[PDB]
C-alpha cells in the first residue's frame, strides 16, 4: 500500500543518486584517456 | 448469531491489518533488490 | 406449525445477513493481498 | 456482494496508482543511465 | 423448488456481474504494467 | 402406492430441471473467469 | 449441459477476439521500437 | 437398476462431448497467443 | 483432440508466414544500410 | 477396470501424437527465425 | 432364508456390474480432460 | 470374512496394475514434451 | 471483457506514443554526435 | 496476426525510407570533404 | 516405473542426437561467414 | 502397518533411482548444448 | 495474530539486511572488473 | 444445563488459545522460508 | 489439549531449525555459482 | 477402558513411526531432484 | 522429433546458401574498390 | 506514463547539451593541432 | 526430521562439489579462447 | 529467405554501380592534377 | 520516425556548412604558403 | 549426480579440444595475410 | 540467514580475488603487445 | 543511393573545375619566372 | 562436435587458399607499378 | 547502496590514477621517438 | 568463396591492365620532356 | 551529468594547453634546422 | 574457483610467450626492410 | 596455441625470405641506373 | 590494479630502452651516408 510505496520512492531516489554519481566518475577516467590520446597525436605529427 | 459475528469482523480486521503490513515489508526488500540491480548495470555499461 | 415457521424465516434471515457480510470482509483481505502482489511484480520487472 | 465489490474497485485503484508511479521513478533512473552512456560515447569518439 | 430457484439465478447473476468487472479492473493494472515495460526497453536500447 | 408414486416422479422431475439449470448458470461465471485469465496472460507476455 | 455449453463457446470466442487484438497492438509498439533502432544505427555508422 | 443405468451412459456421453469441445476452443486461444509471441520475438531480434 | 489440433497447424502456419516475411523486410533495410556504407568508404578513400 | 483402461491408453496415445506434432511445427518457425538472423548478421558484417 | 438369499446375490451382482461400468465411463471423461491439459501445456511452452 | 477378503486383494491388485501403467503412458508424453523443449532451445541459441 | 479491452488499446496507444517520441529525442543526440565527428575529420585532414 | 503484420510492413517501410535518406545526406558531407582535399593537394603540389 | 523409464532414456537419446546435429549445421553457416570475412579483409588491406 | 511400510521404502527407492538417472541424461543434452555454444563463439570471434 | 506478526517484521528485517549487504559485495567485484577494463583500453590505445 | 455450559466456554477457550498459538509458530517457519527465498534471488541476479 | 500442544511447539521448532539450515546450504551452492559467473565474465572481457 | 487405551497409544506410536520415516524417504528424492536442478543451471549459464 | 529435424537441416541449408552468396556479392564491390585505389596510386606517382 | 516521460525529454535534453559542448572543446584542441602543423610545414619548406 | 535432513546436507554437498568443478572446466575453455584472441591481435597489428 | 535475398543482390548491384562510377570521377580529377604537374615541370626545366 | 528525421537533415546541414567553410580557411593558408614558395624560388634563381 | 558429471568433463574436454584447434587454423590465415602485407610494403618502398 | 550469509561474503571475496588477478595477467600481455608496436614504429620511421 | 550519387558527380565536378583552374594560375607564375631567367641569361652572355 | 569441426577445417582451408591467391595478384599490380616508377626515374635523370 | 558506492569511487579513483600514469609513460617513448626523427632529418639535410 | 574469388582475379586483372597502360602514357610525356632538354643543351653549348 | 561535465572542460583545457606548448617546442627545433640550412647554402655558393 | 584459476595463469602465460615471440619475428622482417631502404638511398645519392 | 605458433614462425620466415630477395633485385636496377649516370657525366665533362 | 601496473612501467621501460638504442644505430648509418656525400662533393669540385 501507499505508505509502503513512499518508501519505494525513497530507495529508488538513493538508487538514482548513486547512478549519476558513479557514471560521472567513469567519465573522469574517459577524459584523462581522451586527452592523453591527443598528446600522443601531437608527437606522432611533429 | 449477530453479536458473535461482530467479533468476526474484529478478528478479520486484525487479519487484514497484518496482511498489508507484512506485504509492505516484503516490498522494502524488493526495492533494495531492484535498485541494487540498477547499479550493477551502471558498472556493466561504463 | 405456521407461526413457528415464520420464526424460522426470521432466524434464517439473520443467518444470511451474517453470511454475506462476513464473506464480504474476507474479500477486503483478498483485494489487499492481490494488489500487494501487483506491486511486487512491478519491482521484479523494473 | 455488490457493496463489498465497490471496495474492490477502491483498493485496486490505489493499486494501479502505486504501479504507474513506481514504474515512472524507475524510468527516471534509466534516463540518467542512458544519457550517461551517450557522453561516454562522446569521449570514446573524440 | 422453482420460485426459490429463480432467486438462485438472481444471486448468481449478480455474482457474474461482479466477476467480469473486478477481472476487468485487474487488467487495467496489467496494461499500465506492460506498457511501462516497453518504455523501460526504449531507454535500455537507445 | 402407485398413484402417489407418480407424484414422486413429478417432484423429482422438477428437481432435476432445477439442477441442470443452476449448474448451467454457474458455468456462465466460470467461462467469464477463465477467459479473463487468458487476457491477463496476454499482457504478462507481451 | 449442451445449451449452457453453447454459451461457453460464445464467451470463449469473445476471449480469443480480445487476445489477437491486444497482441496485435503490442506489435505496433515493437515495430516502432525496432525501426527506431535501425536509424540509431545509421547515425552510429555514418 | 440396469435401464436407469443406460441413461447414466447417455448423460455421461453428453458430458464427455462437451468437455473435449470446450477444451478444444481453449486451445484455439492458446495457439493465437503462442504465435503472437513468435512475432514479438521477430521484432525483438531484427 | 485431433480436429482441434488441425486448427493448431493452421494458426501456426500463418504464424510462420508472418515471420519470414517480416524478417525479410528487415533485411531490405540492412542492405540499404550496408551498401550506403560502401559508398561512404569510396569517398574516404579517394 | 481393465477394459476401461485400454481406452485410457488409446486417448493418451492420441494425446502424445498431437504433442510431438505441434511441437514440431513450432520448430519450423524457430528455424526460419534462426536463419533469418544469420543473414542479418551477414549484412552487419560485410 | 436360503433361496431368498440366492436372489440377494443376483441383485447384488447386477449392482456391481452397473458400478464398474459407470465408473469406467467417468474415466473416459477424465482421460480426455487429462490429455487436453497436456496440449495446453505444449502451447504454453513453445 | 477371509475368503471375501482374498477377493479384495485381487481387485486391488488389478487396481495397482492399472495405475502404474497409466502413469507410465503419461510419462511418455512428458518426455516427448521435454525433449521438444531442448531443441527449441538449440535454435534460440544458435 | 470487451469494454475493459478498449481501455487496453487506450493505454497501449499512450505507450506507443511515448516510445516513438523518446526514441526520436535520442536520435537528436546521435545526429549532433555524428556531425561533430565529421568536423573532427576535417581538421585531421587539412 | 495478418492484419497487424501489414502494419509491420508499413512502419518498416517508413524505416527504410528514413535510412537511405539520412545515409544520403551524410554522403553530401563526405563529397565536400573529399574534394576539399583534392584542392589542398593542388596547392601542396604547385 | 522402471520400464517406462527405459523409454525415457530412449526419447532423451533421440533428443540429444537431434541437438548435436542441428548445432553442427549452424556451425557450417558460421564458418562460411567467418571466412568470408577474412577475404573481405584481404581486399581492405591490399 | 510396518511390513506394508517396508514396501513403501522399496517403491520409493525405485523412485529415487529413476530420478537421478533421468536427471542425469538430461544433463548429457545440456553439455552438448553448452559446448556447441562455445564453438559458435570461436567462429564469431576469429 | 499480532505478536506472531511482530516476529515476521523481525525475520524480514534480517532478510533485507542480508540482501543489501550481499548485493553490495557483488558490486565490489564489478568495480574491479570495470576499471580493469579501462586500463586494458589504455594499452589498446597507446 | 447452564453450569455445565460454563465449562463448555472454558474448554473452548483453551481450544482457541492453542490454535492461535500453533498457527503463530507455523508462521515463524514461513517467514524464514520466504526470506531465504529472497537471498536466493539476490545471488540469481547479481 | 495444552500439554499435547507443548509438544506441537517442539516438533515445529525442529521443523524451523531444519528449514533455515537446508535453505542455508542451498545458498552455498548459489554463491559458488554466482562467482563462477563473474570469472567467466572476466575472460569474455579481457 | 484404560487398558484397551494403552493399546491405542501403542498402535498410534507405530503409526507416527511409520510417518516420519516415509516422509523422510520422500525427502531423499526431493534433494536429488533439487540438486540435479542446480547442475542444469550451471550448464545453462556457462 | 526426427522428421521435424530433417526440416531443420533444410531451412538451415537454404540459410547457408544465402550467406555465401550475399557475402560473395559484397566482395564484388570490394574488388572494384581496391583496384580503383591502385589506379589512383598510379596517377599520384607518375 | 506521460508525465514521467516529460522528465525523459528533460534528462535527454541535458544530455544533448553536454554532448555538443564537449565535442566542441575537443575541436578546440584539433584546430590548435592542425595549425601547428601548418607552421611546421613553413619551416620544412623555407 | 533431523536425521533425514543430515542426508539433505550430504546430497547438497555433492551438488556443490559438482558445480564448482564443472564451472571450473568451462573456464578452461574460456582461457584458451581469450588467449587465442590475443594472438589474433598480434598478427592484425604487426 | 530466398526471395528476400534476390532483393539483396539488387541493392548490392546498385551499390557497386555507384562505386565504380564515383571512383571513376575521382580519377578524372587526378589526371588533370598529374598532367598539370608535368607542365609545371616543363617550365622549371626550360 | 519522420519528423524526428527532418531534424536529422537539419543538423547534418549545419554539419556540411561548417565543413566546407573550415576546409576553405585551410586553403587560405595553403595559398599563402604556396606563393611564398614561388618568391623563394625567384631569389634562388636570380 | 557424480557419474553423470564425469560425462560433463568428457564433453567439455572435446569442446576445448575443438576450440584451440579451430582458433589455430584461423591464425594460419592471419599469418599469410600479415606477411602478404609486408611484401606489399616492399614494393611500395623500393 | 546470517551465518549462511557470512559464507556468502567469503566466496564472493575469493571471487573478487580471482578477478583482479586474472585481469592483471591479461594486462601483462597487452603491455608486451603495445610496446612491441612501438619498436615496429621505430623501424617504419628510420 | 542513386540520386544521392548524382550529387556526388556534381560536387566532384566543381572540384575538378577548381583544380585545373588553380593549376593554371600557378603556371602563369612559372612562365614569368622562366622567361625572366632567359633575360638574365642574355646579360650574363653579352 | 568433432565431425562438424572437421568441416570447419575444410572451409577455413578454402579460406586461406583464397587469401594467399588474391594477395598474390595484388602484388602483380604493385610490381608493374614499382618498375614503371623506375623508368620514370631514368628519363628524369638522363 | 550508499556505503558500497563509496567503495566504487575508491576503486575508480585507483583506476584513473593508473591510467594517466601509464598514458604518461607511453608519451615518454613517443618523445624519444619524435626527437630521434629530427636528428635523422639533420643528417638527410646536411 | 571460390567462384566469387575467380571474379576477384578478373577485376584485379583489369586493374593491372589499366595500370601498365596509364604508366606507359606518362612515360611518353617524359621522353618528349627529356629530349627537349637535350636540344636546349645543344643551343646553350654551340 | 552537468557537474561531471564541467570537469570534462577542465581536463580538456589542460589537454589543449599541453598541445600548443609541445607543438611550440618542436618548432624551436625546426627553426634551428631551417636556418642551419641557409648557412650551408652560403658556403655552397661562395 | 582458485585452482581452476591457477590454470588461467598457465594458459595466459603461454599466451604472452607466444605474443612476444611472434612480435619479435615480425621485427626481423622490418629490420631487413629498413636497411634495404638505406642502401637504396646510397645509390640514389652517389 | 604453441604448435599453431610454430607455423607462425614458418610463414613469417618465408615472408622475410621474400623481402630481402625482392629488395635485392630492386637494388640491381638502382646500380645500373647510378652508373649510367656516371657515364652521362663523363661526356658532359669531356 | 596497482601492482599489475608497476609491471606496466617495467615493460614500457624496456620498450623505451630499445627505441632510443635502435634509433641511435640508424643514425650511425646516416652519418656514414652524409659524410660519404661530402667527399663525393670534393671530387666533383676539384
Chains that touch G (3 or more CB pairs under 8 A): E, F, H, I, M, N, Y
Q: Which three cell numbers stand for residue L7?
A: 477377493
CA distance L41 to O19: 9
CA distance AA29 to AI11: 10
Phi, psi (deg, nearest 5) at residue D14 = -55, -45
- Closest by Cα among Q43, P34, Q46, AG22 to W36: AG22
The minimum CA-CA distance between C4 and chain D, rounded to whole Å, is 30
**DSSP codes, chain R:** -HHHHHHHHHHHHHHHHHHHHHHHHHHHHHHHHHHHHHHHHHHHH-
Q: Distance of CA AE17 to CAs AE20, AE23, AE24, Å?
A: 6, 10, 11
Q: Which three cell numbers stand for residue R28?
A: 515463524
- Rg of the Cα trace of chain G? 20
Q: Are AG15 and W35 in contact (CB under 8 A)?
A: yes
CB proximity list for F17: less than 8 A, separation 6 or greater:
none
Q: What angle do CA M39, AF21, AA36 make, to 5 degrees?
A: 75
Nearest CA in chain X to AE28: X38
Helices then strands, counting H and E runs in chain AA, come out as: 1, 0
CA distance V11 to AF7: 19
Contact J27 U12 (CB under 8 A): no
**DSSP codes, V1-46:** -HHHHHHHHHHHHHHHHHHHHHHHHHHHHHHHHHHHHHHHHHHHH-
Z39 close to P (CB below 8 A): no
Q: What angle do CA W22, W25, W27 make, to 5 degrees?
A: 115
The minimum CA-CA distance between K3 and chain J, rounded to whole Å, is 31
CA distance B29 to B35: 10
- Closest by Cα among A40, AG21, M12 to AH10: AG21
DSSP AD1: -
The minimum CA-CA distance between W40 and chain Z, rounded to whole Å, is 6
3+ Cβ–Cβ pairs closer than 8 Å linking AH and V: no
CA distance V21 to L23: 71
Q: Are V23 and M36 in contact (CB under 8 A)?
A: yes
Q: Are G2 and E7 in contact (CB under 8 A)?
A: no
Chain A residues whose CB is inside 8 A of the AD15 CB are: 29
- Closest by Cα among Z42, S36, B32 to R35: B32
Helices then strands, counting H and E runs in chain F, come out as: 1, 0
Chains that touch AH (3 or more CB pairs under 8 A): W, Z, AC, AG
Torsion, CA AA18, CA AA23, CA AA28, CA AA30, rounded to 10:
160
Chain X residues whose CB is inside 8 A of the J29 CB are: none
- When CB atoms are compared, the residue of U35, U38, U46 closest to AC40 is U46
Q: Which three cell numbers stand for residue Z25?
A: 587454423
Where does residue W37 rank: exposed (0-12), middle (13-18), buried (19+ CB within 10 A)? middle
CA distance R30 to S15: 11
W33 close to P (CB below 8 A): yes
Q: Distance of CA L22 to CAs A1, J9, J41, K3, L25, Å?
A: 48, 7, 49, 43, 5
- Cell 415457521, residue located: C5
W19 close to AH (CB below 8 A): no
Q: Are J1 and L14 in contact (CB under 8 A)?
A: yes
CA distance AD12 to Y20: 42
The minimum CA-CA distance between I3 and chain X, rounded to whole Å, is 31
N21 close to G (CB below 8 A): no
- Closest by Cα among Z2, O4, W3, P22 to T28: W3
Q: Which three cell numbers stand for residue AG27?
A: 621485427
Q: Are I14 and J30 in contact (CB under 8 A)?
A: no
Chain T residues whose CB is inside 8 A of the Z8 CB are: 43
CA distance Z33 to Z35: 6
Q: What is the 3-state secondary structure (H, E, C) of chain X?
A: CHHHHHHHHHHHHHHHHHHHHHHHHHHHHHHHHHHHHHHHHHHHHC
The minimum CA-CA distance between V43 and chain M, rounded to whole Å, is 18
Q: Could you report how far apart the first and last alpha carbons of chain I are, in Å?
A: 68
- Closest by Cα among K30, I8, I38, G31 to N6: G31
CA distance A13 to D25: 8
Q: Which three cell numbers stand for residue J19?
A: 504433442
Q: Distance of CA AB5 to CAs N28, X8, AB10, AB15, Å?
A: 9, 19, 9, 15
CB proximity list for AE15: less than 8 A, separation 6 or greater:
U34, U35, U38, U39, AC29
CA distance B32 to C43: 10
CB proximity list for I34: less than 8 A, separation 6 or greater:
J43, J46, U26, X11, X12, X15
CA distance L20 to F32: 37
CA distance D19 to E36: 9
- What does CATH list as the number for AF1-46? 1.20.5.230
E27 close to M (CB below 8 A): yes
Helices then strands, counting H and E runs in chain AG, come out as: 1, 0
Q: How many CA atoms lie within 13 A of A31 on its CB side?
A: 24
The minimum CA-CA distance between O39 and chain AE, rounded to whole Å, is 9
Contact AA25 AG34 (CB under 8 A): no
Preferred mutation among V11, V15, V35, V38 to probe M, highest tally of M CBs within 10 A: V15
- Closest by Cα among B9, M35, Z46 to AH20: Z46
Phi, psi (deg, nearest 5) at residue E30 = -60, -35
Q: Which three cell numbers stand for residue R20?
A: 492461535
U1 close to L (CB below 8 A): yes
Chain E residues whose CB is inside 8 A of the F21 CB are: 5, 9
W1 close to P (CB below 8 A): no
- Closest by Cα among I32, T26, O14, AE19 to AB4: I32
DSSP D39: H
Domain spans of chain M? 1-46
CA distance N22 to N14: 12
CA distance AE14 to AE19: 9
Q: Which three cell numbers stand for residue AG29?
A: 622482417
Residue Z37 C-alpha from the chain's centroid: 20
Resolution of the experimental structure, in angstroms: 3.3
- Closest by Cα among Q30, AD15, Q41 to AA26: Q41
Structural element, H or E, at residue AE2: helix AE2-45
Helix axes AA2-45, S2-45, angle to 10 degrees: 0
Phi, psi (deg, nearest 5) at residue P14 = -55, -45
Nearest CA in chain V to AF27: V40
Q: Which three cell numbers stand for residue T16?
A: 507416527
Contact G35 N22 (CB under 8 A): no
Q: CB atoms < 10 A from the CB of M37, how many?
A: 16
Q: Are AD5 and A16 in contact (CB under 8 A)?
A: no
Q: How many CB pairs under 8 A join AG and AH?
A: 47
**DSSP codes, H1-46:** -HHHHHHHHHHHHHHHHHHHHHHHHHHHHHHHHHHHHHHHHHHHH-
CA distance J27 to J32: 9
Q: Are AH5 and Z28 in contact (CB under 8 A)?
A: no
AH26 close to AG (CB below 8 A): yes
Q: Are AG2 and W21 in contact (CB under 8 A)?
A: no
H7 close to K (CB below 8 A): no
CB proximity list for M4: less than 8 A, separation 6 or greater:
E20, E23, E24, E25, E27, E28
CA distance X33 to P32: 63
CA distance AF26 to AF33: 11
Nearest CA in chain AB to Y27: AB22
AC33 close to O (CB below 8 A): no
Q: Distance of CA I14 to CAs A11, H24, I19, J28, Å?
A: 47, 19, 9, 12
CA distance M45 to AB14: 20
Chain F residues whose CB is inside 8 A of the M1 CB are: 32, 35-36
- Rg of the Cα trace of chain D? 20
Chain T residues whose CB is inside 8 A of the P30 CB are: 40, 43-44
Q: CB atoms < 10 A from the CB of Q36, how many?
A: 24
**Helices (DSSP H) in chain T: which residue ranges?**
2-45
- When CB atoms are compared, the residue of N5, N24, N30 closest to I22 is N5
Chains that touch F (3 or more CB pairs under 8 A): E, G, H, M
Q: Are U23 and J46 in contact (CB under 8 A)?
A: yes
Q: Are O24 and P37 in contact (CB under 8 A)?
A: no
Where does residue V21 rank: exposed (0-12), middle (13-18), buried (19+ CB within 10 A)? middle
Phi, psi (deg, nearest 5) at residue AD14 = -55, -45
P8 close to AC (CB below 8 A): no
Contact C14 B1 (CB under 8 A): yes
- Cell 531432484, residue located: T33
- Closest by Cα among F17, G9, G29 to E31: G29
N12 close to Y (CB below 8 A): no
Contact AH22 Z28 (CB under 8 A): no
CA distance G22 to P27: 39
- Closest by Cα among AE37, AF11, G42 to Y4: G42
Amino acid at each position: 500500500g501507499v505508505i509502503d510505496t513512499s518508501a519505494v520512492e525513497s530507495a529508488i531516489t538513493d538508487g538514482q543518486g548513486d547512478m549519476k554519481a558513479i557514471g560521472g566518475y567513469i567519465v573522469g577516467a574517459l577524459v584523462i584517456l581522451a586527452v592523453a590520446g591527443l598528446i600522443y597525436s601531437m608527437l606522432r605529427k611533429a
